[PDB]
Amino acid sequence: SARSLGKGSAPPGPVPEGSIRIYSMRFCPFAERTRLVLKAKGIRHEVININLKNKPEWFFKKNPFGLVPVLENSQGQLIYESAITCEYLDEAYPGKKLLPDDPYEKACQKMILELFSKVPSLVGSFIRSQNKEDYAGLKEEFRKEFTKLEEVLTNKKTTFFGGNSISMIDYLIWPWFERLEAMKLNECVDHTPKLKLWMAAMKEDPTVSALLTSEKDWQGFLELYLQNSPEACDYGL
Amino acid sequence: SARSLGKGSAPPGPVPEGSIRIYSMRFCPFAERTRLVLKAKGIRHEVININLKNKPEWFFKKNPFGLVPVLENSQGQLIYESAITCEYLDEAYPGKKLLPDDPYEKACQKMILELFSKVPSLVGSFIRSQNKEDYAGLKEEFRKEFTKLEEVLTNKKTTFFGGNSISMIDYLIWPWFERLEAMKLNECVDHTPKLKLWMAAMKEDPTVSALLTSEKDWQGFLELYLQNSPEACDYGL
Ligand SMILES: *CC(=O)N(C)Cc1cnn(-c2ccccc2)c1
Ligand SMILES: *CC(=O)N(C)Cc1cnn(-c2ccccc2)c1
């Protein structure tokens, strides 16, 4: 069931009532945002993994851009863009709100999200390594963006980006910091002490911990991704 | 009072109670989003224009990135990023909501906002013209992005991007289409009929009409902007 669907696969059936479907990929950091929210809010759902190297024809009817995550509810309504799927889930399901209701506090979370906006592209580029001379410069980009996040935590004087308790903004940023060890980028935070403390606090969170991927599984994916293998998305069953 | 403040100007005083302040620029399309929301919701406010060619030192304390629009309330709280200032105003002030309360409908508006995300950078690049051979290709980029917006209106079968009545998403996209005539880009919509009808419907909206800038004022700004003049932001008093 967890095996990714690719080109030639049958379009899935309708989403049953009382459940929501996520079109994801087990190693995708953008899809992980949504999976963190689904877990934190205890939402009943089904997972359909997509082979991003060999996409099913029908997935373009889910998202014309062909990117995961994509949410589909029992009414056939489709929601995509990882931050949008997270806010939609926060609003459409009961329980504690991950995004604060206060207009100013909610705006601050989205202001930090904008501040982080360069990091996913920097990670994407770093994975597809070109030469040794580029690495030291691409790591200089990481230090610059991570100091922006350090200044936020310094000015807030709190453990998390939305206060002294975990909230939406922390789950939105976490997937890229989770992969820092597997990418051998642990030195890019050696000058951001509050950010380093935030990473360890995140690893202790029950939701984050339950969705943690082993160092070996990250490596297995990365190796097959650099080989452009259509088995990359299915590493480690 | 409407004259823009620049380097060497005195930091402004506190925002009085019952009012909100916008740090803007009369010809900035990003700041225009916020000004459209302030008008549509009938919000009492004050406008401080910033000389973007000769920024005041204190403006970096309002937005570390030094970009307009920036909101400041009586509590000294600062809000920036044009879409964030618009949603904050919609949530923190009474009256009709510009963003629908329905989680799915609100998500769709933000999905269209993401779809439009390439157009502001394409406009920014087009203003700073390099050569005649680039123009036809940069206009091919516009047709490609405008067809994405055409497909939305076609699939929705409504006059606006959020239904048969104007809503937030329309004010968020409008400033770039308003400037299409002054930029001589009217041929980039000659293959998007619903988008052309949306533009004329927008021009009839009371809020849009009250914030319309004359063709002569757009030209006066553009000429001085291409000359890198610090008088550009203050064209036409
Ligand atoms: C959904 C998506 O954009 N991808 C699957 C690309 C991607 C970006 N970052 N990763 C990543 C990085 C390090 C380790 C595992 C996965 C994948
Ligand atoms: C706030 C900002 O980004 N600017 C002032 C730059 C800008 C982008 N587009 N315009 C523009 C385009 C055509 C006509 C007037 C203004 C300014």
Output the domain CATH number for residue B151.
Answer: 1.20.1050.10
Q: Are residues A7 and A103 in the same domain?
A: no
Range of the domain at A8: 1-98+214-237
Q: Would the annotation count A81 as a binding residue?
A: yes
Q: Are residues A179 and A168 in the same domain?
A: yes
From chain A, the residues in CB contact with B103 under 8 A are 88, 91-92
Rounded CA-CA distance A126/A29 in Å is 14
Question: Which tokens hold the place of A82?
Answer: 């990882």
CB–CB of A92 and B80 under 8 A? Answer: no
Which residues fall within 8 angstroms of residue B107, CB to CB, at 6 or more apart?
Answer: A79, A84, A85, A87, A88
One-letter amino acid at A200 equals A
Q: Are residues A126 and A202 in the same domain?
A: yes
Resolution reading in Å: 2.1
From chain B, the residues in CB contact with A84 under 8 A are 107, 110-111, 114
- We report the CATH number of the domain holding residue A35 as 3.40.30.10
Give the best residue of B63, B70, B88 to mutate against chain A (max A CB count within 10 A). B88
Nearest ligand 1 atom to the CA of A213 is: 15
Q: How many domains does chain A have?
A: 2
Question: Which tokens hold the place of A42?
Answer: 């205890």
> Mapping DSSP to helix (H, G, I), strand (E, B) and coil, where does residue A21 land?
strand
Contacts 24+ apart (CB under 8 A), A92-99: A92/B103, A92/B104, A93/A41, A93/A43, A95/A41, A95/A42, A96/A41, A98/A37, A98/A40, A98/A41, A98/A167, A98/A168, A98/A171, A99/A167, A99/A168
- Residue B78's DSSP bridge partners are B72
> Mapping DSSP to helix (H, G, I), strand (E, B) and coil, where does residue A209 land?
helix
Rounded CA-CA distance B119/B149 in Å is 11
Q: Are residues B103 and B200 in the same domain?
A: yes
Q: How far is the CA of A226 from the centre of ligand 1 (A)?
A: 11
Chain-centre distance of CA B188, in angstroms? 20
Rounded CA-CA distance B45/B38 in Å is 8
Rounded CA-CA distance B182/B156 in Å is 29
Residue among B73, B80, B104 whose CB faces A111 most closely: B80
Instruction: Round the CA-based radius of gyration of chain B to a whole number and report it.
Output: 18
Q: Are residues A178 and A223 in the same domain?
A: no
Tell me how crowded residue A166 is: count the other CB atoms within 10 A of its CB: 23
Give helix then strand counts, H and E, for chain A.
Answer: 10, 4
Q: Any idea which ligand is nearest the CA of A217?
A: 1
Q: Are residues A94 and A128 in the same domain?
A: no
Q: Are residues B78 and B153 in the same domain?
A: no
> Mapping DSSP to helix (H, G, I), strand (E, B) and coil, where does residue B7 land?
coil
Which residue in chain A is spatially nearest to B72 when comparing CA positions?
A: A104
Sign of CA dihedral B100, B101, B105, B108: positive
Which residues fall within 8 angstroms of residue A224, CB to CB, at 6 or more apart?
Answer: A231, A232, A235
Give the closest-approach CA distance of B104 to chain A in angstroms. Answer: 7
Tell me how crowded residue A217 is: count the other CB atoms within 10 A of its CB: 16
Question: Which tokens hold the place of B123?
Answer: 């406009």
Region class of A42: left (phi > 0), else alpha (psi between -120 and 50), else beta: left
Q: Are residues A80 and A123 in the same domain?
A: no
Q: How far is CA A9 from CA A78, A80, A81, in A?
A: 20, 21, 24
Residue with tokens 């931050």: A83
Rounded CA-CA distance A11/A17 in Å is 19
Rounded CA-CA distance B231/B51 in Å is 8
Rounded CA-CA distance A220/A227 in Å is 11
Q: Would the annotation count B68 as a binding residue?
A: yes
Tell me, using a 6 A CB cutoff, whether residue B127 lines ligand 2: yes
Q: Are residues B29 and B118 in the same domain?
A: no
Sign of CA dihedral A51, A54, A55, A58: negative
> Mapping DSSP to helix (H, G, I), strand (E, B) and coil, where does residue B202 land?
helix
Name the structure determination technique: X-ray
Sign of CA dihedral B121, B123, B125, B128: negative
> Mapping DSSP to helix (H, G, I), strand (E, B) and coil, where does residue A76 land?
coil
Region class of A90: left (phi > 0), else alpha (psi between -120 and 50), else beta: alpha
Question: Which tokens hold the place of B127?
Answer: 């203003």
Q: Are residues A45 and A130 in the same domain?
A: no
Q: Which positions of B are annotated as active-site residues?
A: 28
How many CA atoms does the CB half-sphere of B140 hold within 13 Å? 5
Q: Are residues B109 and B144 in the same domain?
A: yes
Rounded CA-CA distance A9/B87 in Å is 41
Q: Are residues A44 and A137 in the same domain?
A: no
Nearest ligand 2 atom to the CA of B123 is: 9
The Cα angle at residue A37 between residues A36 and A40, in degrees rounded to 5: 85
Tell me, using a 6 A CB cutoff, whether residue B218 lines ligand 2: yes
Rounded CA-CA distance B194/B150 in Å is 6
CB–CB of B104 and A111 under 8 A? Answer: no
